[PDB]
Structure 1
């Protein structure tokens, strides 16, 4: 705009929280659908929903990870990554059912002398492959659900050979998007790229997506956030560059049904 407005400079405000950015590459609304509450015509559980609104629909910052020349990639699941975040997580464990959309804001700045590119992908039903060649579909709940620390991708498949006491975790191979399909095609999922010379963030607005109107948040993850280095981190002539990556996610239009006593899950 001739009054200064730019594609690159954005401010997002949800609840008591604000994010500013001066090096954005626009922002993405997955499948062109903004998040919405459940409509009467599509409703299913008949009890009055709880809509916690600003107390849950605000920007929660997760633990910061570090991008290095050896990084193979990172992943998180939603709502799992947010299960312990303020009143959102509480609303989640108190109810049988819940649904939510999300604004995902991935943050990564560097300098005009660094380089590298992160592919930031929002995947619906991001089912990841297990570590075993003796038993399919055996990743335990605890390992499928890292919470806010997330998990990582690997460049190599090392199968779990301890048959006595199996690791029972994922073994997500990076060029295979952790699920047996080629990474070069993950761009058909809603995404942005953080290419250090161009932008320092990714912003994905995600609708609630599911084969149902509402479901068990504790049993099922609707979206997977996968971040992989499309072009490796590099700086000046340093051999061990590092820049931080921070995730901030906000739930949107979230509502919950089936109130009872709180769920207390076995997470370790």
Structure 2
């Protein structure tokens, strides 16, 4: 084969070769409306899809809850005080005690699912601030102990719907007798050790209180595996960090609440058995 600028393959094995404001969306029995939402982000431009047999690893017939699990669950609300650094919720670990989705993911061994995350935070025309919502895939976070690595515990690494928080400054877990085994992600490093500024490479939106009060993210199912355990592996992760601090009428104690509404989409399960009863506290 004479290629343009003589390529002959001598080895059978291949490895040996050479080198917009208005929005209303309905999922099941749940409906979401937002008159000042600045469009949606289809993360990586891929809508969630059911597993296709062409790339199907397991054989067992999949149980798709459909309406009973592809609903919008509103996680708890969090106050965005002036001196707040951020929050992070891992998925689907957040939807583990939410309706029938939690039951299905605990009962079934393997499970895949996309998500639709709607972050809601509204302020008056006289408020001043801006949030950034990033859907970090495979979101890891740094530990708190400099004497050990990858030492975080299951209970502390999976807060649930309560979520987690970013700390302004790192603080080693100096306790050498009973280490807390707890995440200590620095806000500007984003926890992973990278920089916040570059974090925009991830699928993201910005809730700028002057322009929009909502942020919609359609997160597909990204994973090295077509289907994987939901109780072990947390595919995505939502991180909400305030790019610019809240401010209002020269008032030093302004608070506004931020809410999340997550809807599993095209969620499929396999491998039914006794129900997982994990230790979380």
TM-score range normalised by the length of the shorter chain? over 0.9
Q: TM-score, normalised by structure 1?
A: 0.97
SS in 1 for 2:128: strand
Per-residue deviation, 1:3: 61
Distance 1:240 1:37, change over 3 A: same
Distance 1:27 1:227, change over 3 A: same
CA distance in 1, matches of 2:138, 2:243: 22
CA distance in 2, matches of 1:5, 1:63: 54
Distance 1:251 1:142, change over 3 A: same
Per-residue deviation, 1:84: 0.6
SS in 2 for 1:148: coil
Distance 1:185 1:97, change over 3 A: same
CA distance in 2, matches of 1:264, 1:39: 30
CA distance in 2, matches of 1:6, 1:21: 50
Q: Corresponding residue for 1:84? A: 97
**CA offsets 1:10-45 (integer angstroms, 9 cap, x no match):** 001000010000111111000000000000000011
Runs of at least 5 residues in structure 2 that lack an aligned partner in the other structure: 1-13
Q: Does 1:131 align with 2:149?
A: no
Q: Corresponding residue for 1:227? A: 240
Distance 1:3 1:252, change over 3 A: farther
**CA offsets 1:219-242 (integer angstroms, 9 cap, x no match):** 010001000000000001110000
**CA offsets 1:133-190 (integer angstroms, 9 cap, x no match):** 1101001000000000000001100000111011100001011011100000010000
Per-residue deviation, 1:120: 0.3
**1:29 maps to which of 30, 42, 66:** 42
Distance 1:170 1:2, change over 3 A: closer
SS in 2 for 1:176: coil
Distance 1:239 1:193, change over 3 A: same
**CA offsets 1:66-113 (integer angstroms, 9 cap, x no match):** 001110000000000000110100000001100000000000001000
The structure with the larger Rg is 2
CA distance in 1, matches of 2:174, 2:32: 46
Runs of at least 5 residues in structure 1 that lack an aligned partner in the other structure: none
Per-residue deviation, 1:259: 0.3
Per-residue deviation, 1:193: 0.2
SS in 2 for 1:166: coil
**CA offsets 1:194-228 (integer angstroms, 9 cap, x no match):** 01000001100000110000001000100010000
CA RMSD of aligned residues (A): 8.0
CA distance in 2, matches of 1:114, 1:4: 61
Distance 1:23 1:5, change over 3 A: farther
Distance 1:3 1:234, change over 3 A: farther
SS in 1 for 2:100: helix
CA distance in 2, matches of 1:90, 1:83: 8
CA distance in 2, matches of 1:6, 1:56: 46
CA distance in 2, matches of 1:67, 1:226: 14
Q: TM-score, normalised by structure 2?
A: 0.93
Per-residue deviation, 1:6: 49
Per-residue deviation, 1:65: 0.5
